[PDB]
């Protein structure tokens, strides 16, 4: 039987590259997405062409709310209904935007989205994944710059910190069940789509290793490692994939 | 005249020792509480008799919800109303209980643990900064064990990790306004009063320095230092007050 | 043409496991050793019988001294003598024993061996490896997942592993413009000491969340070969724990 | 009687401030120096004029060598000889200069950089503990230890070892009531020979006030850590960096 993996925010960019690579490794994949339906199905169709019936999509908002636990359980359920098992969970979906401390979304909504996507949804997904259960593991997409935060990203940053906490807490608690829990922490990877190249270049020039951002595939390479049998004693570890960015002083 | 401090969860144990010491140092104090009304108004009495018109209490639930931003705003407004100023914010209040991955709802457990330990601090910090020869500073009560978490305390631990992230992000963003943001990280201090001799002594025996818990007063002394004029260049620092506990391997 | 790797303290245990895996992946290897000559020659024999002229040994003391930089330079030279190139350096060799702060070997000697093998030799060897330079050059340093929760009375050993973190980070920063990656692999409990009794090993085993056992030398080698591989081309200055959760467990 | 402290490299700059401030708090002090006799003495003079026979000097090279152990034992002895007790040891002395990985002998650089920043603290720590209230050690660390200066691997290794010793010694010595802590400056007093523009470049990086810390600011955290207000604090390293270590590249 082929193992199966859930990847949140898999329609595009890093999530997509993670789904593709998992599929290429022989996983069946649930491609979860929020708004990006067209990209999600194009990915599913592309993947099913390679091997039939190996890819499904699954839509959900991962913003914090009283329906979030149910949403997260349903995501996990969808992998089971589709494939009869859930071997891997990748928590990749993430809201990201500034939330300045001082002077259109309300602050409670910014909390719900930024803390929901980056932390709470990963927690609920992790409970549901675990409640349902070999080489079982969770990979959380963290942030190598978490202790050198961007100006005015406090809620994003709090969310990523919480994710580190979850990574560790869940690694300890789920180890008796045989479920490993790890993280991949990008520094600068794929820059935002419509960011001017001149601004992209300020970021690239920061990276010691080749003055360039990570490809989504290079991020995905670390995830693959973490799910593989070459990482079977690795739990609670966060691998930075950052080109040395996090080592550079101001 | 006298500066003023807000201390959250100041009705008892460690928050109360912080409120007392701050008062003893010259501060007027807002004593925030949730459910501990009798103990709250009792401390305010004790303090005002010692220096009249230097303490009020302020009730608020710090669970996350859409109205939490207003409740936090009101806590800060309460300090200005009573004292015309707000120089010090101490984020001490905290829910703490297990939330295993495998009769409160999960939605409620997330609301309480993450709201009290993380979201409220962030919102308070925001309202504190928005309202602003001075020495303005914020002290967050963190946790020395945040990287060696209690088994099945994931939401609590996520919260405390987010508080680290807040401590750093807000230290960075508020430096240009002369507001310092730091933390104090206890290990084992006053043990939950619901706990037995064997388990209390189990915790005591782990602590290399004197095989005992920290006094509330020992925690408050580090707080007092960080708000003091001897910490004018300190921001974004978290000081463990843990007797070495965090250094001890399993 | 195959790449070549230097693995220090490679005669047995984790270093041998690293050398063997690098060899199976297609590397030619320099098996450095200090006292364990028989085991080293025996390892190179097996590897050469698998593919001729792919394995050599190279003896050196990695204790700190004024000639230690020449000793480290010769190790790297031996890889270039034997194979014409050096693509990978694994800093594995390590002295490990208690040095109580309150109270055999002189303190001087303790400092030299513990700091020398765990930090100073890795620094000097990193120096020679860089100085002596399709390609994928990296360095992997064998660290310790327990550096921040150290064993009682091991201050000099812990000092050295902390310095090795320092080197991993500093060297990753400084050598990135040359294309050389520098990372680390941090065991918790792996192969227990040969002289430790089974009862005490079981005590160590029972602390590990992931399976209540120590890591196999192979599990450690697996993460080394990941970091040297093309699957880790953007990774530098990262230290991967291979500890089964151990560093996460409170007292 | 009043307690005594040893402060290594106390003749100038951050160590002098640490010594003065300990003295003003009521400590008697040993002012260790290597090259700065004249300054060590001036300081001893100035302190003794305030309070008679409360301040002595002590010379030693803290470079790693076969004699380092005895030198460190002597430094601790001088405090017992001068005042009959030794309550505080501040490891402040430190060599600091670049040691590029690609091109003094390197092993002299190892001896100086590692000896000053890690081995001497370790030996003084041993002699301090051996020769035994509110006893504590305060090590001067570096808030930028994880974001190190380019070409300073050896210095950075030493300060990492110092973190290591801070933690190991706090653990091992807690049984004796001996607390072991660190103070980690970011940019404090800039190097005397650094260019004026170079200095302002570093100042500008600092979030809190775009200035360096004064030695006094550094010493303030030292004094806290030795005070009774830190009697449960061990194994802690307090940054005093104005948020410099938080700022991304
Ligand atoms: N790219 C980088 O440089 C970088 C740096 C550090 C860390 N990381 C981390 O690496 C991971 C992948 O990064 P990325 O740049 O590829 O991410 P991204 O493009 O910013 O976001 C990934 C996906 O997250 C989903 N998402 C956003 N808000 C959501 C919501 N409320 N509910 C459900 N899904 C939501 C989106 O789905 P739809 O498109 O379907 O709406 C989106 O495509 C993230 O966790 C990120 O924080 C990235
Ligand atoms: N005790 C330790 O050993 C230890 C160890 C590590 C960290 N800490 C941290 O140090 C701080 C003090 O610890 P502690 O043991 O004194 O705290 P604690 O007694 O568990 O809690 C202190 C106060 O938090 C308030 N609180 C709880 N839930 C709340 C809510 N929903 N809204 C508003 N307030 C709420 C309570 O107020 P009412 O009584 O008024 O309801 C309570 O008095 C905490 O942040 C804690 O995490 C303590
Ligand atoms: N084993 C574990 O549980 C564990 C845990 C944490 C970290 N690690 C790290 O992983 C690495 C491998 O561990 P291990 O247990 O396999 O190592 P080990 O057996 O303790 O040491 C490996 C080799 O170190 C070499 N060595 C010792 N002193 C030397 C000196 N003065 N000069 C040159 N070489 C010297 C020895 O070579 P000869 O035999 O030829 O004399 C020895 O075979 C080490 O860096 C270790 O600290 C291991
Ligand atoms: N200044 C900063 O911005 C900064 C930043 C981060 C960390 N720190 C740390 O804070 C501490 C104080 O800093 P600083 O700038 O005041 O230091 P510094 O002036 O570079 O050096 C302080 C003293 O250390 C002594 N020293 C140097 N080499 C020695 C040797 N081989 N043997 C014995 N003593 C020796 C010297 O004493 P003599 O003059 O008597 O020869 C020198 O005066 C240091 O540990 C430093 O690493 C400082
Ligand atoms: N979800 C999400 N999307 C992102 N684009 C980022 C980035 C990032 C954004 C711009 C420059 C460097 C990094 C950093 N973290 C991110 N998280
Ligand atoms: N709010 C709150 N209350 C607490 N009692 C704690 C503790 C703690 C609880 C039990 C033993 C040792 C520490 C740790 N963190 C805590 N946070
Ligand atoms: N070189 C070397 N050999 C070792 N055996 C170790 C260990 C280790 C030793 C005993 C129990 C757990 C870990 C930890 N670090 C080590 N380094
Ligand atoms: N002993 C010693 N002296 C120093 N001057 C330093 C510095 C430092 C030197 C220049 C700019 C910023 C920091 C950093 N660490 C230092 N240690």
Chain B interface disruption, residue of D226, D236, D247, most B CBs within 10 A: D236
The rounded distance, in Å, linking the Cα atoms of C15 and C29 is: 11
Rounded to the nearest angstrom, the minimum Cα separation between C125 and chain A is 21
The rounded distance, in Å, linking the Cα atoms of C69 and C76 is: 11
Contact A102 B130 (CB under 8 A): yes
Ligand 5 pocket list (CB less than 6 A): A 94, 96, 143, 188, 191-192, 203
Spatial CB neighbours of D25, under 8 Å, sequence gap ≥ 6: D223, D227
CB C205 within 8 A of CB C214: yes
Q: Which atom, in ligand 5's list, is nearest to the CA of A94?
A: 1
CB neighbourhood size of A218 (10 A): 21
> Residue A124 forms beta bridges with which residues?
none
CB neighbourhood size of B52 (10 A): 8
Q: Which residues of C touch A218 (CB under 8 A)?
A: 233-234
Ligand 1 pocket list (CB less than 6 A): A 9, 11-15, 33-36, 61-63, 92-96, 113, 117, 141, 143, 186, 188-190
Instruction: Decide: C191 in ligand 7 pocket, CB within 6 A.
Output: no
Question: What is the residue with the minimal CA distance to atom 2 of ligand 8?
Answer: D96
Contact B149 C207 (CB under 8 A): no
CB neighbourhood size of B72 (10 A): 26
Contact B149 A172 (CB under 8 A): yes
**Which of A143, A221, A233, A242 is the catalytic position?**
A143
Kindly report the backbone phi and psi dihedral angles of residue C186, in degrees, each rounded to the nearest multiple of 5, phi listed first: -120, 95
Spatial CB neighbours of B133, under 8 Å, sequence gap ≥ 6: none
Question: What is the residue with the minimal CA distance to atom 12 of ligand 6?
Answer: B188
CB D175 within 8 A of CB D217: no
How far apart are the two ends of chain A, measured CA to CA in Å? 51
Contact C176 A243 (CB under 8 A): yes
Domains, chain B: 1-250 (3.40.50.720)
Nearest residue to B227 via CA among B8, B5, B2 = B5
Catalytic residues of C: 144, 157
Binding-site positions of A for substrate read 137
Q: In what order do the strands lie in the sheet with A179-186?
A: A55-59, A28-33, A4-7, A88-91, A136-141, A179-186, A238-241
> Residue B7 forms beta bridges with which residues?
B31, B90
Tell how far the Cα of D158 is from the centroid of ligand 4, in angstroms. Answer: 13
Q: Which residues of C touch D148 (CB under 8 A)?
A: 166, 169-170, 173
Nearest residue to C214 via CA among C13, C33, C25, C11 = C13
Sign of the CA dihedral D78, D82, D84, D90? negative
CB B28 within 8 A of CB B5: yes
* DSSP secondary structure, A39-75, as one string: HHHHHHHHHHHHSTT-EEEEE---S-STTHHHHHHHH
Testing ligand 4's pocket by substitution, the residue of D34, D108, D137, D222 carrying the most ligand atoms inside 8 A of its CB is D34
Active site residue B143: yes
Tell how far the Cα of D148 is from the centroid of ligand 8, in angstroms. Answer: 11
The rounded distance, in Å, linking the Cα atoms of B149 and B159 is: 12
Tell me if D236 is assigned to a ligand binding site.
Answer: no
DSSP B144: T
Q: Which residues of D touch B21 (CB under 8 A)?
A: none
Kindly report the backbone phi and psi dihedral angles of residue D91, in degrees, each rounded to the nearest multiple of 5, phi listed first: -90, 100
What region, left, alpha or beta, does residue A206 occupy, with left being phi > 0 and alpha being psi -120 to 50 degrees? alpha
The rounded distance, in Å, linking the Cα atoms of B111 and B71 is: 15
Q: H or E stretch including D30?
A: strand D28-33
Q: How far is CA C119 from the centre of its chain?
A: 11
Catalytic residues of D: 142, 155
Strands D178-185 and A136-141: unpaired
Query: Angle at Cα B242 formed by Cα D142 and Cα D27, nearest 5°?
Result: 65
Nearest CA in chain C to A221: C231
Tell how far the Cα of B182 is from the centroid of ligand 7, in angstroms. Answer: 37
On the 0-12 / 13-18 / 19+ scale of CB atoms within 10 A, A84 is: exposed
**Which of B143, B147, B233, B242 is the catalytic position?**
B143
On the 0-12 / 13-18 / 19+ scale of CB atoms within 10 A, D68 is: buried
The rounded distance, in Å, linking the Cα atoms of A226 and A237 is: 9
Strands D88-91 and D55-59: unpaired
The rounded distance, in Å, linking the Cα atoms of C91 and B146 is: 31
Strands A238-241 and B4-7: unpaired
- Neighbours of A, requiring at least 3 CB pairs below 8 Å, are B, C, D
> CA Rg, chain A, in Å?
17
Question: What is the signed CA dihedral for D182, D184, D190, D195, rounded to 10 degrees?
Answer: 140
Question: What is the signed CA dihedral for A183, A188, A190, A195, rounded to 10 degrees?
Answer: 140
The rounded distance, in Å, linking the Cα atoms of A226 and A241 is: 13
Q: Residue C176: which of A218, A222, A244 has the nearest Cβ? A: A244
Q: Which residues of D touch A240 (CB under 8 A)?
A: none
Instruction: Decide: D112 in ligand 4 pocket, CB within 6 A.
Output: yes
Question: What is the residue with the minimal CA distance to atom 11 of ligand 8?
Answer: D190
CB C247 within 8 A of CB C182: no
Q: Residue C219: which of A175, A176, A232 has the nearest Cβ? A: A232
Strands B238-241 and C4-7: unpaired
The rounded distance, in Å, linking the Cα atoms of D176 and D172 is: 9
Q: Which atom, in ligand 5's list, is nearest to the CA of A187?
A: 13
Distances (CA, A) of B22 to B15, B93, B116, D18: 10, 16, 22, 27
Spatial CB neighbours of A206, under 8 Å, sequence gap ≥ 6: A188, A245, A248, D249
Question: What is the signed CA dihedral for A225, A229, A231, A233, rounded to 10 degrees?
Answer: 170
The rounded distance, in Å, linking the Cα atoms of C57 and A229 is: 31
The rounded distance, in Å, linking the Cα atoms of A151 and A168 is: 26
Distances (CA, A) of C167 to C118, C173, D151, D166: 11, 10, 11, 18
Nearest residue to B94 via CA among B181, B219, B244, B245 = B219
Q: How far is CA A132 from the centre of its chain?
A: 20
Q: Which atom, in ligand 3's list, is nearest to the CA of C34?
A: 40
Distances (CA, A) of D194 to A250, D197, D200, D216: 18, 8, 10, 21
Q: How far is CA D45 from the centre of its chain?
A: 22
Task: Give me the helix-helix angle, C121-131 and C155-175, nearest 10°.
Answer: 20
Rounded to the nearest angstrom, the minimum Cα separation between B243 and chain A is 23
* Nearest ligand by distance to the CA of C217: 3
Q: Residue A247: which of D147, D244, D247 has the nearest Cβ? A: D147
Tell how far the Cα of B168 is from the centroid of ligand 1, in angstroms. Answer: 23
Tell me if B190 is assigned to a ligand binding site.
Answer: yes
């Amino acid at each position: 039987e082929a193992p199966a993996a859930v990847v949140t925010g898999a329609a595009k960019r890093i999530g997509r590259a993670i789904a593709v690579k998992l599929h290429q490794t022989g996983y069946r994949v649930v491609i979860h997405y929020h708004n990006s339906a067209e990209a999600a199905v194009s990915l599913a169709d592309e993947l099913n062409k390679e091997r039939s019936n190996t890819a499904v999509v699954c839509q959900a908002d991962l913003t914090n709310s009283n329906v979030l636990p149910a949403s997260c359980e349903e995501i996990i359920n969808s992998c089971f209904r589709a494939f009869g098992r859930c071997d891997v969970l990748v928590n990749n979906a993430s809201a990201f935007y500034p939330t300045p401390l001082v002077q259109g979304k309300t602050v409670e909504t910014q909390v719900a989205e930024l803390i929901g996507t980056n932390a709470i949804a990963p927690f609920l997904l992790t409970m549901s994944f675990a409640q349902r259960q070999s080489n079982l593991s969770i990979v959380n997409l963290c942030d190598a710059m978490v202790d050198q935060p961007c100006m005015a990203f406090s809620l994003y940053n709090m969310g990523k910190h919480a994710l580190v906490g979850l990574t560790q807490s869940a690694a300890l608690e789920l180890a008796p069940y045989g479920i490993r829990v790890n993280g991949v922490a990008p520094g600068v990877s794929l820059l935002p789509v419509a960011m001017g190249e001149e601004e992209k270049d300020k970021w690239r020039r920061k990276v010691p290793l080749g003055r360039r951002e990570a490809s989504a595939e290079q991020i995905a390479d670390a995830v693959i490692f973490l799910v593989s049998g070459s990482a079977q004693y690795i739990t609670g570890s966060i691998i930075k994939v950052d080109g040395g960015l996090s080592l550079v002083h101001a």
